Amino acid sequence: AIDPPLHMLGFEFDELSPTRITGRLPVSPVCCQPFKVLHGGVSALIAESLASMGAHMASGFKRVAGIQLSINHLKSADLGDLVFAEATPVSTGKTIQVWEVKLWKTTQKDKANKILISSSRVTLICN
Amino acid sequence: AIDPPLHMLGFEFDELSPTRITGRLPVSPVCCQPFKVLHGGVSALIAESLASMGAHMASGFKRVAGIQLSINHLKSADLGDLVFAEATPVSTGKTIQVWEVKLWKTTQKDKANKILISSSRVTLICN
Amino acid sequence: AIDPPLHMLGFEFDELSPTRITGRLPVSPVCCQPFKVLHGGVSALIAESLASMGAHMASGFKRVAGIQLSINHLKSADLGDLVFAEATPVSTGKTIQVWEVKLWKTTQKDKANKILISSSRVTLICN
Amino acid sequence: AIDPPLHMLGFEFDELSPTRITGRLPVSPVCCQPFKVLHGGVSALIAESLASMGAHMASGFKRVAGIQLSINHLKSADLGDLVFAEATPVSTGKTIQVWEVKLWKTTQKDKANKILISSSRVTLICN
């Protein structure tokens, strides 16, 4: 509950390191836009949170701010699916960092096969 | 509670029409990344939600899906500020709609003067 | 010919100032992707050039670099159309500037009616 | 001369297949913004062109149109460097394709080591 929005959505962190942040989100009702699919805004919120955590870590816990996000929503995910997120750096300098955040789903019917649903690039200035 | 995650964050919708959607968000602790500023992911979530509501309306209630979001974070907003959001169409065709979403803040000290903090373009596919 | 790509494409500048840069591009064969429509890459090249010129001017002719561009291609333009470009600042601080670049077309048949075909946001760091 | 503005800038295509398009660009004076670095607009123009060629191929030669481009400029390239470009699909469906385009440079001094300078995501609508 230090990212309260992520906590509220039921996101759970797996790995944190300066080169990689992962976690998971069961797609629950609070996560959905009204057709019982995952809200694209929730994918965007995830991308921003994990990229900012990554950047903080990669910068020596100096202050960072997201200044641009670009996200592609590739496929929908349904209520009851499970989403996996992974953030990694595309570029780290002293001033600008760029992170990529990928989201994949698995379903009730098929739980093995991670299907890419979202891909994002987050640009951050590191103070 | 026509967008459940936004409702839980304290967002209130104001105007809905086929050319303009608005509402407001008090910047409360649940909306903040941990330095007591508004979470950039929340700004993204707002852009996606309002653009989607707009498109759904402007399309005559066909199914719409956000496929790309680009957001610029221009300025931060602090805990205790009030955020105002406005979505309007940049382009509406039969298949693709592009909506712009602007976020402004006012503060405790200065409540007259809306200061732009974020601007977003959301690309949606319709029917 | 200080932006040689723009010169090569036949772009012509109209107004330069720290708050507004305009010009025009006849849509000629060199400007087209192979269906005799304006190349989306050419719109993107315009957006980058004008935004960078604007930022240079607005920054006191200090060094600037484009670090992110996001562009929406809203409508096509045909061989023989005329394109108009306008760059203006969305946000100017000391470190980050954000410019918007809009492109409109007029056609042989209809020359009065400027139809918006492209809209872009360019994020620049100003050194 | 399957993309005329790129051809005039000195771009050479290398590989075409439904999952990968490549080519190269010597960074010559015609490709430069005026401080003797590669024009960011040229990097954008490359992304759009190659993603579009890819989509046209991966769709079985249906008509495709770029509707959104997001590009991160990570590092500059100097006059005299050589740029390598590679486009590959992130998502291919029937209606929307998303392609990623990476640009790398090598230099006169160091010709072995490809250094990533740009990364782009291009969203296209097909048929």
From Swiss-Prot, chains A, B, C, D:
Mostly expressed in roots, stems, leaves and siliques. It is found in: Peroxisome. Keywords: Hydrolase, Peroxisome. Pathway: Cofactor biosynthesis; phylloquinone biosynthesis; Quinol/quinone metabolism; 1,4-dihydroxy-2-naphthoate biosynthesis; 1,4-dihydroxy-2-naphthoate from chorismate: step 7/7. Transmembrane segments: none annotated. GO terms for cellular component: peroxisome. GO terms for biological process: phylloquinone biosynthetic process; protein homotetramerization. Its main location: other. Disruption phenotype: Reduced DHNA-CoA thioesterase activity and phylloquinone content. Catalyzes the hydrolysis of the thioester bond of 1,4-dihydroxy-2-naphthoyl-CoA (DHNA-CoA) in peroxisomes, a necessary step to form the naphthoquinone ring of phylloquinone (vitamin K(1)). Is not active on benzoyl-CoA, phenylacetyl-CoA, succinyl-CoA and palmitoyl-CoA thioesters. Belongs to the 4-hydroxybenzoyl-CoA thioesterase family. DHNA-CoA hydrolase subfamily. Homotetramers. This is 1,4-dihydroxy-2-naphthoyl-CoA thioesterase 1. It comes from Arabidopsis thaliana. The gene is DHNAT1. The chain holds residues 10 to 136 of 156 of the full protein.
